[PDB]
Amino acid sequence: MDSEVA
Amino acid sequence: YTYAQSLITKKLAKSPLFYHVLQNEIHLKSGQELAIKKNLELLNRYPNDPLTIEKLSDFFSKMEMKESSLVYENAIKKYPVSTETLCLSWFDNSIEKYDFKVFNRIFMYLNKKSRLHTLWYAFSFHLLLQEETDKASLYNSLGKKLMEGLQPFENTQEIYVYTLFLSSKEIEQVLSGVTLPLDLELKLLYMKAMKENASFEALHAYTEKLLFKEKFDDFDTWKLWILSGKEIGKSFEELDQKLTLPTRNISLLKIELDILYSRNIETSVENYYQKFNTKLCCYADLSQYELPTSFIGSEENLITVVNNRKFVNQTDNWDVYERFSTKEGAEYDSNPVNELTLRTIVSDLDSSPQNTIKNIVLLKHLLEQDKYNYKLKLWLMKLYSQLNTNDLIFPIYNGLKIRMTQHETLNYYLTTTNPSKINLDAWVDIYRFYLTSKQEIKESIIQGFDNGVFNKLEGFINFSKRMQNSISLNFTVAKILQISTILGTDGYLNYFIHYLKTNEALIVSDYTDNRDFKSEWNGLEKIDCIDVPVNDVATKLKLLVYSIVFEDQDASRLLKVFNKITSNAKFSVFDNLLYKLYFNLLKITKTKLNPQETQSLYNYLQKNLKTDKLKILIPENLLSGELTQNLTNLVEFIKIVKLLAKRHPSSYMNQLVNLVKPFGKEFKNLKLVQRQHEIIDSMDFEPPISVDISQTKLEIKSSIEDCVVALLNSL
Amino acid sequence: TSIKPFQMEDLFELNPVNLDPLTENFNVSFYSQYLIEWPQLFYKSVETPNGQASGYMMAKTEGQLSKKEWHTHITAVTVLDQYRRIGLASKLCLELENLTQVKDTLFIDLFVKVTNTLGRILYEKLGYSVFRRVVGYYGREIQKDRNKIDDSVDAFDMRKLLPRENGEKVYVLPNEIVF
Ligand SMILES: CC(C)(COP(=O)(O)OP(=O)(O)OC[C@H]1O[C@@H](n2cnc3c(N)ncnc32)[C@H](O)[C@@H]1OP(=O)(O)O)[C@@H](O)C(=O)NCCC(=O)NCCS
């Protein structure tokens, strides 16, 4: 999963 | 909050600038605190160089209590290129922080050359002097030599600031030598100086020119003229023969001139009366002096009857009223007869509910014709504050067109109003006044300095100071928090919790009082009487209660303050119970205690959160407004119990929330409205005039029912 | 009785004068701005006994001399009810004509409620003439027909010429008075 802050 | 933090790190990474780092440190402070103070101190050790950055760092150090000053001082020394913009920033930033003490320090850097800025520096030495008797002489001497450095002075404002550092004997020599035409400010000071210095030959000459050649007609100046005259030897006749015209000022001066030459007063007193009995000012003027026996010895003119009755101090005046009950003259004027009717009503007030209700009918009756009589309106509000008729005061208040600064001096008339959403909105709007006036006075102080108006700057400064933390400001916040939590609405609740958390230093200090307890007494003698039921200490305690409810780190400090205040409180029996309940409830929920301490405090809450105990909140006179005022406070307490059981859930809190479920039905069975209706229905009035009692009875009954029931439905 | 300069803190004690129905209570901004920009044209009358405020004059200077419109304006006069009918408001308005700063201007301006009987009597005796009727000047609703006059909200702009029209029927709207 990547993450929100991106 | 947390998305702001990730945003700030993004920014700091990109910079990898100063203003962003500061903002991040501030967030870390909010989230947390020592971490942030370290970060800020680290940032201060690095040479702050940007204006906005340096401004934010100074505000951070003011928040956490001498490092804010040292942010700007560093920047000023290390980059003198910008020293003026840095100083002006510091100045504006200091006015907004109500930090008036630092002014001299800013002005010193900013002077080390503009002439206006020298004036600022000098003026600031006066402002310091208006606080430390050990350094008085040095400050006075410093500002004095600053102003001598600027001679010749160019205007009366410069001259004014010079006088701030001069003795009375220096002031007279300076002003006698001024080439510029003096303003009124300085003329008064010149005369003050000459009177204090017994320079009477000079005084008499100066006043003669003003009064006679200039036809100034100033009573204060007239008094200095006859005083200077006797001292330089002139006789009664030489002065009196110069007093021809029958102006109001000269007529009264003849009395003052008789007094000064120990001559007999009666002829001058009778001459004034015969010339001014047709004017409403007559009584206030002659009441200044010791009027002779014989003059009290002594119609087609109402104002003459008014005066004469006031001279004889006549308490019953209803005869005159039916002669002149009909409003005549200009629409917007008042009926002078009601100077006497109001006198009779105030003398008849005896704080018993029947007398209150009777005098309400009378006041309402007189306002039917004297639509704009403000004193009747204020007294009518005062009588309504004695009962549970809580929704009847706001209409009178708004009809007076109370607005802006008047709220600060008069909003206490609304002390007993009911917690309706309509009133909440009115209260929020009063708060809007405080917000806007806060900004306007700050900008007016800045601009007063940018122009050269030292004549009025101390007034501006003190005006701001007196509004920063007044009981009227805090009562407004207490009210908004109370009504907000009583209803279900929270549109502004979070805003004002933030005000408390941001201003704890103010909240726990002594509040300034600018309230007007004088205006309803204008042209009467202030006897002891009924009062609007204010409770300033409770206002503080309430704000402390909410401050503690929403304390997230450590509630012990605020609770010591709370306990110190309640311990000296002077409360009634129920108010004492109520803040002990708050004490025990707050400490259970907001402080770490061991299982035994907790059970102890819980059992006190358990013992007394019962109607049989809280029944003591009900006054013996059921028609007293203490009833709803206490009820309101009980409702607010219960809401705070329920809020805390959510914020800090526990089995104990669950038992208290259950304990308070039956209160509503139980107090409803005390039949508080019915009993009040029964008392009113059994009152016999013989009013001193023909008035319809029934509509006031019907209005009062309906207002009592509506207000009590709304509180009872809130339990 | 005695006249003293106005200072901002006097607002805290002006209620007996400013609760009168024809006396407006302005923003802190407004009072202070006058004290900043025309400090000698804001002054008060005090009582004999305690220095109780009897009334005040709040005035300004405004306008372009090239446009013949450089004048002194009265934004507020009022006398405490106890001290009326004894020359006091006249003393306040005439003392204004005496100041050098006012003498420098061409005329004295003021608005008065059409329904305000005593204010009109005051300026009539002082030598003021009705220069124009300002339509809705004191009213909330901003209106476009100058002929929809309304005595409860309209104003008479009064002028008195100083040493340096002939209709009460010129209807003008508030936003055409610019200076
Ligand atoms: C209340 C008010 C009457 C006080 O004024 P004042 O200082 O008493 O005025 P004076 O007593 O000096 O008299 C001024 C002139 O007006 C006339 N006048 C004043 N009060 C009067 C009254 N009640 N009935 C009839 N005429 C009156 C007088 O004739 C007098 O001139 P004269 O006596 O030489 O003919 C009014 O002028 C005022 O100042 N109101 C303040 C608020 C307001 O209504 N308007 C604001 C100014 S636009």
Size of interface B-C (CB pairs under 8 A): 150
CA–CA distance, B121 with B130 (Å, rounded to integer): 15
C138 is in an annotated binding site: no
CA–CA distance, B125 with B127 (Å, rounded to integer): 5
Tell me the chain B residues in contact with residue C29 when contact means C-beta distances shorter than 8 Å: 436-437, 440, 443-444
Tell me the chain C residues in contact with residue B466 when contact means C-beta distances shorter than 8 Å: 9, 12
Q: CB–CB of B448/B457 below 8 Å?
A: yes
Q: Hey, which residues 1-6 in chain A have their CB within 8 Å of chain B?
A: 4-5
Give the torsion through C-alpha atoms of B326, B330, B331, B336, to 10 deg.
-50
Which atom of ligand 1 is closest in space to residue C83's alpha carbon?
Answer: 8
Residue of A nearest to B7 (CA): A5
Tell me the chain B residues in contact with residue A5 when contact means C-beta distances shorter than 8 Å: 6, 10
Q: CB–CB of B418/B707 below 8 Å?
A: yes
- Using DSSP, how many helices (H) and how many strands (E) does chain C show? 5, 8
Question: Which value in Å is the resolution of this experimental model?
Answer: 2.7
Instruction: Tell whether B613 is covered by a domain.
Output: yes
Instruction: Tell whether B526 is covered by a domain.
Output: yes
Q: CB–CB of B29/B57 below 8 Å?
A: no
| Final residue belonging to a domain, choices B62, B83, B112 | B112
| Final residue belonging to a domain, choices B58, B89, B112 | B112
Nearest CA to ligand 1 atom 14: C122
Q: If you write DSSP's letter for every residue of C46-99 in order, what string do you get?
A: E-SSS--EEEEEEEEEE--TTTT--EEEEEEEEE-GGGTTSSHHHHHHHHHHHS
- Phi, psi for residue B329 in degrees, rounded to 5: 95, -165
Cβ of C89 less than 6 Å from ligand 1: yes
CA–CA distance, C101 with C61 (Å, rounded to integer): 8
Cβ of C118 less than 6 Å from ligand 1: yes
Tell me the chain A residues in contact with residue B6 when contact means C-beta distances shorter than 8 Å: 4-5
Cβ of C22 less than 6 Å from ligand 1: yes
- Phi, psi for residue B418 in degrees, rounded to 5: -80, 155
Other chains touching A, judged by 3 or more CB pairs under 8 Å: B
Q: CB–CB of C31/C11 below 8 Å?
A: yes
Report CA B256 to chain centroid distance, whole Å. Answer: 36
CA–CA distance, C134 with C146 (Å, rounded to integer): 8
Helices B67-78 and B103-111, axial angle in degrees (round to 10): 0
Cβ of C122 less than 6 Å from ligand 1: yes
CA–CA distance, C4 with C1 (Å, rounded to integer): 10
Q: CB–CB of C176/C142 below 8 Å?
A: no
| Final residue belonging to a domain, choices B112, B139, B166 | B112
Cβ of C23 less than 6 Å from ligand 1: yes
Residue of C nearest to B220 (CA): C2
Q: CA torsion sign, B294 to B297 to B301 to B307?
A: positive
| Cα distance from N-terminal residue to C-terminal residue, chain B | 36
Q: Do C35 and B440 touch (CB under 8 A)?
A: no
Number of domains in chain B: 2
Bridge-partner residues for C72, per DSSP?
A: C61, C108
Which atom of ligand 1 is closest in space to residue C88's alpha carbon?
Answer: 7
Q: CB–CB of B619/B629 below 8 Å?
A: no
Six-digit token pair at B238? 């030489």
Q: CB–CB of B420/B391 below 8 Å?
A: yes
Report whether the peptide linkage leading into residue B152 is cis, meaning its omega lies within 30 degrees of zero: yes
Element (H, E) at B271: helix B266-276
Six-digit token pair at B539? 């206002």
C116 is in an annotated binding site: yes
CA–CA distance, B149 with B82 (Å, rounded to integer): 25
Nearest to B57 by CA among B106, B12, B20, B105: B20
Q: If you write DSSP's letter for every residue of B495-526 in order, what string do you get?
A: HHHHHHHH-HHHHTSPPB-----SGGGTTS--
Nearest to C33 by CA among C70, C60, C66, C62: C60
The parent domain of residue B581 ranges over 385-712
